């Protein structure tokens, strides 16, 4: 099975290209993922451009396949069971009162190096808001992730929103339209209802100069 990919330390790359309203950036993750403990440290750097979004409303876009699945639930594991050929990753987020991210990814093997190659469109965002505003708290709640079976295209689909705390007191709620679909023709386990919980902590790199987010995230699966 893929799962046997995922056994021990697994290094990643993730590679965003952004337009958000016709503003234009690339950002570089490396780290590496350990499925064993559920367990992602992953640093991301802005390489192209300038960052017109904060940081924490990319985490969701910016690897499911390292999420800790207990053995009883092992037969539920779509992700892993995708790989090494991969599944495509497509979201539209939709932040209340304000834009929407269309994101589209292929997640796969390259080599021994799981890759994350996303593409991301956001538009209809206000100048003044919580997105272009840069408003939002550089931190992250828990979130569950509930995920179904769709027989019917292959996949799975994935629905959850996102509460990003404001520093004048308020939430900007960001709603997930999830789907993933395998990349390759053979085989991929279609799972009953479940979900994952995603503990993720952001942090900064005292010795890093360019525009960066430090991330560290734990996820397990439950509910079966």
Not at 56 to 79: E, N
Not at 162 to 186: C, F, K, M, W
């Amino acid at each position: 099975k893929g799962e046997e990919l995922f056994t021990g330390v697994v290094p990643i790359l993730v590679e965003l290209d952004g337009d958000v309203n016709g503003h234009k950036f690339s950002v570089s993750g490396e780290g590496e993922g350990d499925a064993t403990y559920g367990k992602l440290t992953l640093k991301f750097i802005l390489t192209t451009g300038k960052l017109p979004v904060p940081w924490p409303t990319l985490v969701t876009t910016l690897v499911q396949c390292f999420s800790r699945y207990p053995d009883h639930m092992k037969q539920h594991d779509f992700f892993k069971s995708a790989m090494p050929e991969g599944y495509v990753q497509e979201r539209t987020i939709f932040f209340k009162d304000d834009g929407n991210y269309k994101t589209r990814a292929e997640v796969k093997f390259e080599g021994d190096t799981l890759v994350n190659r996303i593409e991301l469109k956001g538009i209809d965002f206000k100048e003044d808001g919580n997105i272009l505003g840069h408003k939002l708290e550089y931190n992250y709640n828990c979130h569950n992730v509930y995920i179904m079976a769709d027989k019917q295209k292959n996949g799975i689909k994935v629905n959850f929103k996102i509460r990003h705390n404001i520093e004048d007191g308020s939430v900007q709620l960001a709603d997930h339209y999830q789907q993933n679909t395998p990349i390759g023709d053979g085989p991929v386990l279609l799972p009953d209802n479940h979900y994952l919980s995603t503990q993720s902590a952001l942090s900064k790199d005292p010795n890093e100069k360019r525009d960066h987010m430090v991330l560290l995230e734990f996820v397990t699966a439950a509910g079966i």
